[PDB]
């Protein structure tokens, strides 16, 4: 039993192609608003593995919705942000993901792609004018499938992570490693952005993006705390640069609390 795309890479399909970013089935069972800016697909769900599963699926050269050459196609869902940098302030994300395919470029600076981010505005400039925090990446890995081809076997997941708010590029962003998962493995994911207090300084407040992938904790502290104005998370698929990228995303929940 399988919901996988195996049919050739194209950037647009008909049933793919929709007309604004918020088009959506009805009563999709992965929470939080669509934003659809591919039209390679749109979103859609599968039953398999007894669970039910948001599909989302992309492809280079397919985003119809923002300004040519400018940002990767994506199919994502936004989640309320928690806008408040109290102590004890977060946004908190769950699901369990599976990973079958994801961009590749032949070069890793631009192979990969995400199923999910950290956002959250910052006071002073510096960035778009919605900056992402961090990323989780995930980097294909090649193995034989028993027929003497090349194919995308597991994925490496990386964080691609701010040095400062709002960098970019090879300056203002630096990529760690976390772990590998198989092709279709169900990955239990949590996803928590908040703030909490500092333990090195009684009145500071710490800006954390923690991750649970599978089990494993990859915890991390955002640079400079005192600029962040809230917490944010984004999940689905984005970035695509060569190729196909194709999530799927079971089981998702979602809360926050804003404490001033
Ligand atoms: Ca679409």
Redesign the pocket.
Known sequence: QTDEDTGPVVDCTNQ???PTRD?DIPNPRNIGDID????????SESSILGKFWGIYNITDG?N??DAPNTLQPR?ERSLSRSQATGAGSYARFRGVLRILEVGDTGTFSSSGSYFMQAKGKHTGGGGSPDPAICLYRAHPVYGDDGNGNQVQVSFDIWREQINFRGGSGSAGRTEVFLKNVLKNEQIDIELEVGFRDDPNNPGQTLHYADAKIGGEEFNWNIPEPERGIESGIRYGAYRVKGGRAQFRWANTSYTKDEVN
Not at 36 to 43: T, V
């Open positions: 793919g192609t929709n088009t659809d800016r591919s039209c390679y697909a749109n979103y397919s119809h919705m199919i």
